[PDB]
Design a protein around this ligand. Structure first.
Ligand code: HEM
Ligand SMILES: CC(C)(C)[C@](O)(CCc1ccc(Cl)cc1)Cn1cncn1
Length: 530
C-alpha cells in the first residue's frame, strides 16, 4: 500500500525535466501553455455564470488579429454563434462584448463603482495628453473638467466661432497647395490630407485663438504630427517602449503644453483675459468644487486632450462626408439648393442660426456618423463582479466590458438598409441627438438618463461627449462652404473606400482621392498671400 514509491518518481520526474535537452525544453515552454490554454477554454465553456468565450489558438494574443482588423465582422460572427453577450481574449485582457441597445445600457449606464473608464483608457491618453487630467485623475475631476470645457461651448460661443471657421476654410481654399482656387479651377486631393489640415486650422482658430492658430503657419505644426504619433493603439499594447517615436510624442507633449502655458501665463500677466477662447475660458473657470484650482500644466494638458479628441473624430467625419457625396451628385445638388434657399442665393452670410435651418446638411452629418462611427469600440475595466440581468451571467472584476453603438448603427433591424447611405432616413429628425425622455446630471450638464437609443454616436452616461454641438458647428460651416464652392466626384472606377479600423478612429483606407472643380471658375477669394 505504498504511494510513497510514486511520490519519489514525482521528484525524479521533476529532476529529469530539468535535464531535458534545450530543443525539448523550448518546445515544451511552447507546447505546455498552448495545451493548457485549450484545456482551460474547454473547462471554461461549462461555467453557466460566464458569457460564451470566443475560442482562440494563441495564448495571450487571443482574437486580437481578427478583432483588430475587422471588428464589426468579428462581432457579427460572434453574435450569430453566441448571441449578444460574448467574451474574447485580447492581448492579455478578457473583453466582454454586449451588443445592441441593452449593451449601451449595461455599459454606458454602469454604476461608477462597477466600471472604470480611466482604468481602461489612461495608459494611452496620459502619455499623449499629460498628467493630472482626463483619465489621469479620479472620475469626479473628469466630470468637472468637462463642465469647464462646456463653458466655452455655448450658443454664443458658436455664433462667434462660425465666421472664424468660415474664414479659415476660405483661406485654406485660397492658400493650400491642394486647392489654390484663385489659380486652379479643377484639381485632385487626398481627403486624408486635406481634412486633417482643415480640421486643425479651424479647431485651433476657434478653440485656441489666433496666437495658437498663427503657430500652425510654422514648423511648430510638426509637433502636432509628432504628438499624434503617440495616439496609435500600438501604445495600448506598448504604453512606453524605449525606442524613438515615443520620444517625439513625449517631446511634443512637453513643447505643445509649454506653448499653451506660455500663452496662459502671458495673458494673466498682462490682465488680457477676455471671452475669446477655450483658453480664456479655462483661465476664468477651472476651479474644482473642493476649492482646488487646475494648474497651468493641467489646463494645457486638458487643451491638448480636447483638441486632439475633437481633431480625429471630426477630420474622419468630413473625410467620409466628402467620400460619400463624391458618388452622390444628387445629394450635392440637393444640399446646394438648400444652401441657395437658406442663404438667399448666397447673398446672406452664414451664421450659427442659419446653420440650424439647414436640415439636409445636418442630416448628412447625422447619416455619415451613423455609417462611420469614428470610435468602433468603447471600453471600461470591470471593478466589481457584475450580474447581467435576465441572465445567469457574472462579469468578474478584472474583465473589461466593450460597447459598440457603431455596430448597432449598421444593423438592418434598427436602420433599414443600414449599409446604404441615405440622409432622408432622417427627414424631420435632423437633430444631432435628442434626449428621448428623462435627464440626469453627472456634473457637466443634464443629459439623457436612458441610453437605449440604437443611434448613439456620442455615447451616453457620465462619459458622454461634450463636443457634439461644436462638431456639428465645425462640420456644418465646413460642408456649407464646400457645397457652395465646389462640385466633386471620383476618378474613374474609384468608389467609397473601406474603413481602416486598426487606427485610432475608423478612417478611410488611403489614399482616398476625389476630383474637385469650382462651381464658379471666376470666383476669387480675397485677402493677401505670399
Ligand atoms: C463627430 C464627432 C464626435 C463623435 C462621434 C464623438 C464621440 C464620442 C463618444 C462616443 C464619447 C464617449 C466615450 C466613451 O464612452 O468611452 C465621447 C466622449 C467625449 N468627447 Fe467626443 N465625439 C466627437 C467629437 C468631439 C469633439 C469635437 C470634442 C471636443 C471639442 C469631443 C470631446 C469629448 C470629451 C471631452 C468626451 C468625454 C470623455 C469621457 O468623459 O470619458 N468629442 N465622444
Ligand atoms: C480623446 C478622448 C476625448 C479622451 C477620447 O474619448 C479617447 C477615448 C478612446 C480613444 C480611442 C479608442 Cl480605440 C477608444 C477610446 C476620444 N474622443 C471622444 N470624443 C472625441 N475624441
Amino acid at each position: 500500500s505504498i504511494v510513497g514509491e510514486a511520490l519519489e518518481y514525482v521528484n525524479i520526474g521533476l529532476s529529469h525535466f530539468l535535464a531535458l535537452p534545450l530543443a525539448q525544453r523550448i518546445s515544451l515552454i511552447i507546447i505546455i501553455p498552448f495545451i493548457y490554454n485549450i484545456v482551460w477554454q474547454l473547462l471554461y465553456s461549462l461555467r453557466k455564470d460566464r458569457p460564451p468565450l470566443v475560442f482562440y489558438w494563441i495564448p495571450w494574443v487571443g482574437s486580437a488579429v481578427v478583432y483588430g482588423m475587422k471588428p464589426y465582422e468579428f462581432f457579427e460572427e460572434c453574435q450569430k454563434k453566441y448571441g449578444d453577450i460574448f467574451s474574447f481574449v485580447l492581448l492579455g485582457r478578457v473583453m466582454t462584448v454586449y451588443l445592441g441597445p441593452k449593451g449601451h445600457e449595461f455599459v454606458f449606464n454602469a454604476k461608477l463603482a462597477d466600471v472604470s473608464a480611466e482604468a481602461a483608457y489612461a495608459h494611452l491618453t496620459t502619455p499623449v495628453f499629460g498628467k493630472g487630467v482626463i483619465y489621469d485623475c479620479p472620475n469626479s475631476r473628469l466630470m468637472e473638467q468637462k463642465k469647464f470645457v462646456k463653458g466655452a461651448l455655448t450658443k454664443e460661443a458658436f455664433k462667434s466661432y462660425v465666421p472664424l471657421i468660415a474664414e479659415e476654410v476660405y483661406k485654406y481654399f485660397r492658400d493650400s497647395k491642394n486647392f489654390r482656387l484663385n489659380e486652379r479651377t479643377t484639381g485632385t486631393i487626398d481627403v486624408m490630407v486635406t481634412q486633417p489640415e482643415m480640421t486643425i486650422f479651424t479647431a485651433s482658430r476657434s478653440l485656441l485663438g489666433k496666437e495658437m492658430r498663427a503657430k500652425l503657419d510654422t514648423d511648430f505644426a510638426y509637433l502636432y504630427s509628432d504628438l499624434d504619433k503617440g495616439f496609435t493603439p500600438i501604445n495600448f499594447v506598448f504604453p512606453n517602449l524605449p525606442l524613438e517615436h515615443y520620444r517625439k510624442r513625449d517631446h511634443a507633449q512637453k513643447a505643445i503644453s509649454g506653448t499653451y502655458m506660455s500663452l496662459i501665463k502671458e495673458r494673466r500677466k498682462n490682465n488680457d483675459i477676455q471671452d475669446r477662447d477655450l483658453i480664456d475660458s479655462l483661465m476664468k473657470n477651472s476651479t474644482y468644487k473642493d476649492g482646488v484650482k487646475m494648474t497651468d500644466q493641467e489646463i494645457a494638458n486638458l487643451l491638448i486632450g480636447v483638441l486632439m479628441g475633437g481633431q480625429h473624430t471630426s477630420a474622419a467625419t468630413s473625410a467620409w462626408i466628402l467620400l460619400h457625396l463624391a458618388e452622390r451628385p444628387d445629394v450635392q445638388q440637393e444640399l446646394y439648393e438648400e444652401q441657395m434657399r437658406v442663404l438667399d442665393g448666397g447673398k446672406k452670410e452664414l451664421t450659427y442660426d442659419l446653420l440650424q435651418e439647414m436640415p439636409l446638411l445636418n442630416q448628412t452629418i447625422k447619416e455619415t456618423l451613423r455609417m462611420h462611427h469614428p470610435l468602433h469600440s468603447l471600453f471600461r475595466k470591470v471593478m466589481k463582479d457584475m450580474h447581467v440581468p435576465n441572465t445567469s451571467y457574472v462579469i468578474p472584476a478584472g474583465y473589461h466590458v466593450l460597447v459598440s453603438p457603431g455596430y448597432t448603427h449598421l444593423r438592418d433591424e434598427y436602420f433599414p438598409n443600414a449599409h446604404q447611405f441615405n440622409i432622408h432616413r432622417w427627414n424631420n429628425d435632423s437633430a444631432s441627438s435628442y434626449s428621448v425622455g428623462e435627464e440626469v446630471d453627472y456634473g457637466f450638464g443634464a443629459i439623457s438618463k436612458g441610453v437605449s437609443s440604437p443611434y448613439l454616436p456620442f455615447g451616453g452616461g457620465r462619459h458622454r461627449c461634450i463636443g457634439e454641438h461644436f462638431a456639428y458647428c465645425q462640420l456644418g460651416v465646413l460642408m456649407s462652404i464646400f457645397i457652395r464652392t465646389l462640385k466633386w466626384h471620383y476618378p474613374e472606377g474609384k468608389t467609397v473606400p473601406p474603413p481602416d479600423f486598426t487606427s485610432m478612429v475608423t478612417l478611410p483606407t488611403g489614399p482616398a482621392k476625389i476630383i474637385w472643380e469650382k462651381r464658379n471658375p471666376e470666383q476669387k477669394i480675397g485677402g493677401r498671400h505670399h
